[PDB]
Amino acid sequence: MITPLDVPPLDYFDEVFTSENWMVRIYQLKKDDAQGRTLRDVGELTRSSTKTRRSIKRPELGLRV
Amino acid sequence: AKLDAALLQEASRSPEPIKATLILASSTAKPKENLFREILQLNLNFDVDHSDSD
Amino acid sequence: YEPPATWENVDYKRTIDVSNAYISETIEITIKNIASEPATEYFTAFESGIFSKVSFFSAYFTNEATFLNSQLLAEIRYGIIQFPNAISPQEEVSLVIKSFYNTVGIPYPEHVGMSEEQHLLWETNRLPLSAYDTKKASFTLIGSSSFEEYHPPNDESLLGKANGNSFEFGPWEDIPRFSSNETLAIVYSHNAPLNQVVNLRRDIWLSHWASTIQFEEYYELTNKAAKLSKGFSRLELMKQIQTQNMRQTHFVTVLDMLLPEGATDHYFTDLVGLVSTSHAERDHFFIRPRFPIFGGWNYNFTVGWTNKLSDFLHVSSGSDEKFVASIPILNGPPDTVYDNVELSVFLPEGAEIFDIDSPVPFTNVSIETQKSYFDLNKGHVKLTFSYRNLISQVANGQVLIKYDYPKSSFFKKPLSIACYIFTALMGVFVLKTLNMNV
Amino acid sequence: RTLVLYDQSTEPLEEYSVYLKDLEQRNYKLEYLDINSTSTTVDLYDKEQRLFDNIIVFPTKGGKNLARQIPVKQLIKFFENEGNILCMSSPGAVPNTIRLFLNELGIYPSPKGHVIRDYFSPSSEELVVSSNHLLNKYVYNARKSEDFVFGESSAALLENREQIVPILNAPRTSFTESKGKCNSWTSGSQGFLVVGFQNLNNARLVWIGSSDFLKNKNQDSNQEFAKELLKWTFNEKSVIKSVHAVHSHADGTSYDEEPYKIKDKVIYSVGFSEWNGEEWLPHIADDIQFELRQVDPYYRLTLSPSGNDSETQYYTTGEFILPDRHGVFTFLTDYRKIGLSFTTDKDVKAIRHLANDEYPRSWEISNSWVYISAICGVIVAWIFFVVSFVTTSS
Ligand SMILES: *[C@@H]1O[C@H](CO)[C@@H](O[C@@H]2O[C@H](CO)[C@@H](O[C@@H]3O[C@H](CO)[C@@H](O)[C@H](O)[C@@H]3O)[C@H](O)[C@H]2NC(C)=O)[C@H](O)[C@H]1NC(C)=O
Ligand SMILES: *[C@@H]1O[C@H](CO)[C@@H](O[C@@H]2O[C@H](CO)[C@@H](O)[C@H](O)[C@H]2NC(C)=O)[C@H](O)[C@H]1NC(C)=O
Ligand SMILES: *[C@@H]1O[C@H](CO)[C@@H](O[C@@H]2O[C@H](CO)[C@@H](O)[C@H](O)[C@H]2NC(C)=O)[C@H](O)[C@H]1NC(C)=O
Ligand SMILES: *[C@@H]1O[C@H](CO)[C@@H](O)[C@H](O)[C@H]1NC(C)=O
C-alpha cells in the first residue's frame, strides 16, 4: 500500500496518455527551459516555496569565464 | 589547488603567466600615489582533464 | 461580375444560428423593382473566405413556399437566384435565403480543462454585404446561451442588445452598397462536441447474385473543439465520469450511427484490429472508440453493414434488364461536418451505366473498374462521386443511377469460373497424356 | 508595442524624455503607466495573447505597487513569448520583483546597501567608465575612446549560462561597500555594470545598473551607446534569418529521387541574413559550422560563402564524402554566437548500406579474372562433354 507522501513529483516529463485500466502509460520529454535554468528549479519555483519568506545572500557562484 | 575550475584550463591551454596585482588605494589619499602595480607572475606545469567550464 | 440595378431591399432580416457546429443563416428579404426593363434574376454576395466553405443555398417565397432556382456560381463572389413568373417593374416581392456553412469558429481560450465550459470566437459582417441598396435591415444572432462581443465599438448604435437566448442588433437604415466597413467578432459558449471528419470514403456494393447491398464507410474524424491544458490525465477523466451524469461536454465517448431500416451484419474496426465496444440495436448503431477524442485529437475508423437490395434497387418498366438504384448519399452521426466525401458505388461486372443524377452539386465524378473477389474479367464498375462540403443534417439526398445488366452478362460469372476450372483440368489432361520416360 | 513603468518622488519621467521621443521618431506606439498615479493592474494578457511587444521599467522601489503591477511569474510568462525587457537598478532603488526575476536569469544585482566605488579619480564626483571595457560587439562597438557616466551604480554577479550576453564591465579596480558590516558583493572586474540576456525564443533583456545613465542631463558621453543599446534590447539591431538549408547530391539530384548511400558525394547549402532595423542585408560571417551527426558528430565543416543575393548571403560546405557507417544521420547547423540571434537548422535523413547490385563487379575487379575464366572453362568443357558423350558409341 502506497501513500501520496511517497511518489516524488516528475519535473522533466509529463504524461500524455494513460489507458483505461492504467496499463500502458505514455509520457513525453517536455522541452528544456527557455531561460536556461534546470527544470527541477522550475518545478521547485512553481510550488511549495517558500511561504513568502526570502533571503539575500552572496550567491557563491565562482567566476564567469 | 583550491582555485576555481575555470582559470586553470585557460592557463593550461594557452601558455601565459597568471599575474598577481596588489591594491592599497584609499579615499582620503590624493591620486598619483595609489598602488595599481602588478607585482608577481606565477607559472603552472600541471595536467588537466576534459569537460571544461567549454 | 457586378449586377447593374433593378432590385432595392425594403426589408432585410439576417438571423445567424450558431447552435450545432455549423453556421446557418436565414435571410428574409422583401424587394422592390425599379421602372426599367423588367429583369428576372438576383445576386447574393458572399466573401471570398465564406464562398469557399458553403454547403447549402436555397430560396423560398414567404407567402406560401414552393422553391426557387437557386444556383451557386463557380474578391466578393455571388450566387444567382432565378424567379419564375417574370416580375412587373414596380411590385413588391418576398424572399427567404437559407444557407449552411462549414466553419464554426476558433476556441477563444484554446486551452481549457475538460470540466470547464468553452467559448468560441466567430468573425463575420455587421453591415450586410448586399449587391443592392437597402432601406431597412435588422440582424438577429440566435443560438446558445451566452453571447459577448469582442472589441466592442465606441458607437452606442451598432451595439448588441441581448435578448433571452438571443443577441439582436444591426445597422437599421440606409446602407448604400457593398459594406465591409466593420467586421464583427463574437464569443459564445458552445457545448456541442464539434465532430468533423476530414476524409470520408464510403463504398457500396450492389450484388445481383446475393440480392444484397453492402455498405462500408471509412471515417477520418477530428474534434475541432478546444484543446486541453496540462495534458490528459485518466484520473481526472475517470473521476469526471464517476461524479455525475455526463452532461454535454467536449470529448467523444459514443457515436450514434443512423443506418437504413433493416441492417444486418454490423462491424466496427480500427486500423489496428477490431473494436468490441459497439452496440447494434434496432435502427441504431452505437460506437465507443478506444480512446475518448478530446480537443484536437484524430481517430480513423471503419464501420459497415449489409442491407437487402430489394429496397434500394428497382427494375424499370420498358426493359426487364434495366435497373435503377437510389443510394443514400450520407449516413453518419447526427452532429458532424464532412470536409471531403467520396462516394464509390460499385455495380456488378457486366453493368453499363446509362444515366446519372445527383441532388447535391458534386465536385467530381468518374467511371473506373475495380477487381473484387472472383472478378476474372475486367471487374466491378466503380462509379465514384467526389463531394466537397456536406452537412449530416442538411444533405438529405439520394443518388440515382440508371444502368442495365442483361442476363447474357448475369450468367458470365459462373461461366467464367467454369472456364478457369475447365482450362485447369484440360491442363491436367495435357500433363498426363504426355510421355516423359528416359 | 512598448510600455513604460515609472514612479514619481524617486526618478521622474521628464529626465528621460530625450530617449523616449527618440522611440517616437521610430514607429513605436508608446504607452505610459505611472506608479503612485494608477491603481489598476496591467492587463498584460487578456486571455492568452500578448498585448505589448516591449516593456521598459524605470527605477523605483518595489514594496507593494510593483508586485501589484507585474509579479515575477507574470514576467517570466511575458519573457517566454518574445517579450523584450529593459530594466534598471541603482543602490538608491533596488526593486524586489526585478531582483528576484533577474535571479531566475542568472543575473545577481547588488542589493540596497551595496554601492560600487572606483578610486584613482576618473572624475572624482561620479563614477565614469571608459569604452575599453565593452566586452561584446553586435550591441555597441566604439569607433574611438569615450567615457560613459555612472553616477552611483551597482554591479552584478553573473552565472556561467550560455544565454547571458555581457556588454560592459566594471573598471577592474572597483568594489562594493555598505553601511552595514557585510561582505563585499563583487570584486574588481567580475562585476558587470550592464548585462544583456537572450532567451531561447530570441527575446532580449538588458539590465542596466544606474539611474544616472539614461538621464536627459547626459548626452555628452553616453548618447550613441544608449541609442544602440536600445536598438539591441528590442529586436531591431542584430537578428538573423536562415532561409534555405538544402542538401543534395553533388551532381544535382535530390534525396527524394535517389536516397543516400554510404560513401556518397553530397553538397550542403545554408544562407543567412541580418536586419539593421530597415532591410534584410546579407550576413558576412566566419565561424559557421556544419555537423553531420549521430549521437556523436561525424563532421564539423566550416562554411565558405560561395554565393550572394540581394537579401541573403549563402554558404556551402564543399563536396564531402558520407561515412561508411550506416545509420540515421542528422544534418545540423547550430549558429550560436552570443550577442546576435541563435539559429538552428536540422534535417534527419537515413543513410543506407550498398545494395547487392551496387558492388564492384567480378569482371571489373582484376583479381576475379582467373575464376571467371575457370568457370567458363568448366562450362564449355561440360558442353563438349555432353555432346561428345552422346555422339560416341559404347
Ligand atoms: C487519419 O486521418 C487523418 C485525417 O486525414 C490524417 O491526418 C492527416 O495526415 C497527413 C499526413 O500525416 C497530414 O499532412 C501533413 O500536413 C502538414 C501540414 O498541414 C505537413 O507538415 C506534413 O508534412 C503532412 O503533409 C494532414 O495534415 C493530416 N490531417 C489533419 C486534419 O490533421 C492521418 O494521417 C490519418 N492517420 C492514419 C494513421 O491513417
Ligand atoms: C476527378 O476525378 C478523376 C478520376 O478519373 C481524376 O483524375 C485522376 O487523377 C489522378 C491523380 O490523383 C491521376 O493519377 C489519374 O491518372 C487521373 N485519371 C484520369 C482518368 O484523369 C481527377 O484528377 C479529378 N479532378 C478533380 C478536380 O478532382
Ligand atoms: C506619492 O504618494 C504619496 C503618498 O500618498 C503622496 O503624498 C500625498 O499627497 C497628497 C496630495 O498630492 C496629500 O493630500 C497626502 O496627504 C500625501 N500623503 C502623504 C503620506 O504624504 C504623493 O503626492 C504621491 N506623489 C504624487 C506625484 O502624486
Ligand atoms: C553581394 O553581397 C553584398 C552584401 O552586402 C550586397 O550588397 C551586393 O548587392 C551583392 N551583390 C550581388 C551581385 O548579389
Discontinuities in chain D (C→N > 2.5 Å), after residue: none
Kindly report the number of other CB atoms within 10 A of residue C345's CB atom.
Answer: 22
Looking at all shown ligands, the one closest to residue D60's CA atom is 3
Q: What is the residue whose three cell numbers read 452478362?
A: C409
Q: Which residues pair with C390 in a beta bridge?
A: C338
- What SS3 string covers chain C? CCCCCCCEEEEEEEEEECCCCCCEEEEEEEEECCCCCCCCCEEEEECCCCCCCEEEEEEECCCCCCCCEEEECCCCEEEEEECCCCCCCCCEEEEEEEEEECCCCEECCCECCCCCCCEEEEEEECCCCCCCCEEECEEEEECCCCEEECCCCCCCCCCCEEECCEEEECCCEEECCCCCCCEEEEEEECCCCCEEECCEEEEEEEECCCCEEEEEEEEEEEECCCECCCCCCHHHHHHHHHHCCCCCCCCECCEEEECCCCCCCCEEECCCCECCCEEEECCEEEECCCCCECCCCEEEEEEEEEEEHHHCEEECCCCCCEEEEEEECCCCCCCEEECCEEEEEEECCCCEEEEEECCCCCCEEEEEEECCCCCCCCCEEEEEEEECCEECCCCCCEEEEEEECCHHHHCHHHHHHHHHHHHHHHHHHHCCCCCCCC
- What's phi and psi for C407, nearest 5 deg? -70, -15
CA pair distance C194, C18, nearest whole angstrom: 12
**Contact call for residues C158 and C171 (beta carbons, < 8 A):** yes
Find the CB nearest B34 among D119, D160, D188: D119
CA pair distance C269, C254, nearest whole angstrom: 15
Kindly list the residues from chain B whose CB atom is less than 8 angstroms away from the CB atom of residue D120.
Answer: 25, 31, 34, 36
Report which secondary-structure segment, H or E, holds D300. strand D297-302
Report which secondary-structure segment, H or E, holds D85. strand D84-88
- For residue D207, give the amino acid letter: W
Q: Which residues contact D48 (CB under 8 A, 6 or more apart)?
A: C109, C110, C111
Q: Which residues contact B42 (CB under 8 A, 6 or more apart)?
A: B17, B18, B19, B20
Query: Of D164, D150, D165, which is closest to residue D115 (Cα–Cα)?
Result: D150
Helices (runs of H) and strands (runs of E) counted in chain A = 1, 2
CA pair distance D13, D24, nearest whole angstrom: 15
Query: Of D209, D118, D109, D128, which is closest to residue D172 (Cα–Cα)?
Result: D118
Query: Of C415, C432, C360, which is closest to residue C391 (Cα–Cα)?
Result: C360
CA pair distance D294, D291, nearest whole angstrom: 10
CA-CA-CA-CA torsion for C360, C332, C143, C292, nearest 10 degrees?
-140
Please, what is the Cα angle at D94 between D88 and D98, to 5 degrees?
A: 60
Nearest-atom number in ligand 4 for the CA of D281 is 5
CA pair distance C264, D46, nearest whole angstrom: 54
Output the CA–CA distances (angstroms, integers) from residue D275 to D239, D280, D340, in the order listed.
Answer: 6, 5, 11
Output the CA–CA distances (angstroms, integers) from residue C191 to C114, C164, C195, D95, in the order listed.
Answer: 12, 18, 12, 46
* Beta-carbon pairs below 8 A across chains B and D: 16
Q: How far is CA D320 from its chain centroid?
A: 28
Kindly report the number of other CB atoms within 10 A of residue D251's CB atom.
Answer: 10
Cα(first)–Cα(last) distance of chain C, in Å? 89
Query: Of D105, D104, D152, D148, which is closest to residue D125 (Cα–Cα)?
Result: D152
Question: CB distance from D190 to chain B under 8 Å?
Answer: no
Query: Of C235, C243, C289, which is closest to residue A18 (Cα–Cα)?
Result: C235
Question: CB distance from B41 to chain D under 8 Å?
Answer: no
CA pair distance C219, C200, nearest whole angstrom: 5
Discontinuities in chain A (C→N > 2.5 Å), after residue: none
CA pair distance D233, D2, nearest whole angstrom: 12
3-class secondary structure, D177: strand
Q: Kind of pairing, strands C183-189 and C147-149?
A: antiparallel
| Tally of CA atoms within 13 A in the half-sphere of C232 that contains its CB | 22
Pocket test for ligand 2, best of C201, C343, C366 (most atoms within 8 A of CB): C366
Burial class (CB in 10 A: 0-12, 13-18, 19+), B41: exposed
Helices D96-104 and D72-79: crossing angle, nearest 10°? Answer: 50
**Contact call for residues D102 and D135 (beta carbons, < 8 A):** no
Looking at all shown ligands, the one closest to residue C297's CA atom is 1
Query: Of D41, D90, D361, which is closest to residue D210 (Cα–Cα)?
Result: D90
**Contact call for residues C286 and C278 (beta carbons, < 8 A):** yes
CA pair distance C360, D240, nearest whole angstrom: 52
Residues making up chain D, counted from first to last = 394
Query: Of B3, D190, B1, which is closest to residue A65 (Cα–Cα)?
Result: D190
A65:B10 CB<8 A = yes
Helix intervals (H) in chain D: 17-25, 65-69, 72-79, 96-104, 224-233, 369-391
**Contact call for residues C151 and C182 (beta carbons, < 8 A):** no
Report which secondary-structure segment, H or E, holds A42. helix A39-45
Question: CB distance from D173 to chain B under 8 Å?
Answer: yes
Q: Which residues pair with A30 in a beta bridge?
A: none
Query: Of D10, D21, D49, which is closest to residue D2 (Cα–Cα)?
Result: D21
Query: Of C382, C391, C298, C303, which is closest to residue C343 (Cα–Cα)?
Result: C382
Query: Of C102, C130, C125, C127, which is closest to residue C24 (Cα–Cα)?
Result: C102
Q: Best of A7, A10, A13, A17 to disrupt the C interface by mutation (most C CBs within 10 Å)?
A: A17
D104:A65 CB<8 A = no
Q: Is the dihedral of CA C257, C260, C262, C263 positive or negative?
A: negative
Query: Of D185, D161, D166, D183, which is closest to residue D175 (Cα–Cα)?
Result: D185
| Tally of CA atoms within 13 A in the half-sphere of D373 that contains its CB | 5
Whether the ω angle into residue C134 lies within 30 degrees of 0, i.e. cis, is no
CA pair distance D276, D292, nearest whole angstrom: 32
CA pair distance A22, D219, nearest whole angstrom: 68
3-class secondary structure, D315: strand
CA pair distance D285, C327, nearest whole angstrom: 67
Query: Of C382, C363, C362, which is closest to residue C371 (Cα–Cα)?
Result: C382
Discontinuities in chain C (C→N > 2.5 Å), after residue: 74
CA pair distance D194, D131, nearest whole angstrom: 13
Query: Of C351, C322, C259, C333, which is closest to residue C293 (Cα–Cα)?
Result: C333
- For residue C415, give the amino acid letter: L
- Distance from the Cα of A8 to chain B's closest Cα (Å) equals 31
3-class secondary structure, B52: coil
Report which protein residue has its CA nearest ligand 4's atom 8: D310
Report which protein residue has its CA nearest ligand 2's atom 24: C364
- What's phi and psi for C255, nearest 5 deg? -125, 140
Please, what is the Cα angle at D196 between D192 and D199, to 5 degrees?
A: 140
Q: What is the DSSP track for D179-202?
A: SSSPPPS--TTT-BSEEEEE-TTS
**Contact call for residues C87 and C33 (beta carbons, < 8 A):** yes
Output the CA–CA distances (angstroms, integers) from residue D283 to C23, D14, D141, D303, in the order listed.
Answer: 50, 39, 17, 13
Helices (runs of H) and strands (runs of E) counted in chain D = 6, 23
Kindly report the number of other CB atoms within 10 A of residue C59's CB atom.
Answer: 22
Question: CB distance from D125 to chain B under 8 Å?
Answer: no
**Contact call for residues C122 and C23 (beta carbons, < 8 A):** yes
**Contact call for residues B32 and B13 (beta carbons, < 8 A):** no
Kindly list the residues from chain B whose CB atom is less than 8 angstroms away from the CB atom of residue D115.
Answer: none
Find the CB nearest D80 among A32, A34, A61: A34
Ligand 1 neighbour C270 (Cβ under 6 A): no
Establish whether chain A is in contact with chain D, requiring a minimum of 3 CB pairs below 8 angstroms: yes
Please, what is the Cα angle at D297 between D292 and D302, to 5 degrees?
A: 60
3-class secondary structure, D345: strand
Q: Which residues contact D58 (CB under 8 A, 6 or more apart)?
A: D4, D5, D6, D7, D11, D13, D16, D88
**Contact call for residues D351 and D261 (beta carbons, < 8 A):** yes
- What's phi and psi for A42, nearest 5 deg? -70, -40
**Contact call for residues C349 and C375 (beta carbons, < 8 A):** yes
CA pair distance D36, D34, nearest whole angstrom: 6
D173:B36 CB<8 A = yes
Establish whether chain B is in contact with chain D, requiring a minimum of 3 CB pairs below 8 angstroms: yes
**Contact call for residues D75 and D99 (beta carbons, < 8 A):** no
Interfacial residues of C (vs A; Cβ cutoff 8 Å): 231-235, 291
| Tally of CA atoms within 13 A in the half-sphere of C1 that contains its CB | 8
Report which protein residue has its CA nearest ligand 3's atom 5: D36
Q: What is the DSSP track for D108-142?
A: EE--SS-EEEE-S-SSSSSEEEEGGGB--TTT---
- What's phi and psi for D229, nearest 5 deg? -65, -45
Question: CB distance from A58 to chain D under 8 Å?
Answer: yes
Kindly report the number of other CB atoms within 10 A of residue C241's CB atom.
Answer: 12
A65:B5 CB<8 A = no
**Contact call for residues C109 and C158 (beta carbons, < 8 A):** no
Enter the C-alpha cell of residue C207: 450484388
Segment D250-258 long-range contacts (CB within 8 Å, at least 24 positions apart):
D250/D319, D255/D349
Question: CB distance from C109 to chain D under 8 Å?
Answer: yes
Report which protein residue has its CA nearest ligand 3's atom 23: D36
Interfacial residues of A (vs C; Cβ cutoff 8 Å): 14-20, 22, 28
Please, what is the Cα angle at C215 between C211 and C221, to 5 degrees?
A: 180
Kindly report the number of other CB atoms within 10 A of residue D234's CB atom.
Answer: 22
CA pair distance C333, C392, nearest whole angstrom: 7
Question: CB distance from D43 to chain C under 8 Å?
Answer: no
**Contact call for residues C150 and C167 (beta carbons, < 8 A):** no
Enter the C-alpha cell of residue C231: 495534458
CA pair distance C238, C232, nearest whole angstrom: 11
Looking at all shown ligands, the one closest to residue C220's CA atom is 1
Ligand 4 neighbour D62 (Cβ under 6 A): no
List pocket residues of ligand 2, CB cut-off 6 Å: C 364, 366, 386
Please, what is the Cα angle at C300 between C292 and C274, to 5 degrees?
A: 80
Report which secondary-structure segment, H or E, holds A41. helix A39-45
**Contact call for residues D166 and D135 (beta carbons, < 8 A):** yes
- What's phi and psi for D22, nearest 5 deg? -60, -40
Interfacial residues of D (vs A; Cβ cutoff 8 Å): 73, 76, 79-80, 96, 100, 103-106, 108, 111, 157-163, 166, 183, 185, 190, 199-201, 203
Find the CB nearest C231 among A16, A20, A22: A16
Residue C319 C-alpha to ligand 3 middle, in angstroms? 102
CA pair distance A44, A32, nearest whole angstrom: 15
Enter the C-alpha cell of residue C265: 451484419
Burial class (CB in 10 A: 0-12, 13-18, 19+), C274: exposed
- Distance from the Cα of A24 to chain D's closest Cα (Å) equals 28
**Contact call for residues C102 and C198 (beta carbons, < 8 A):** no
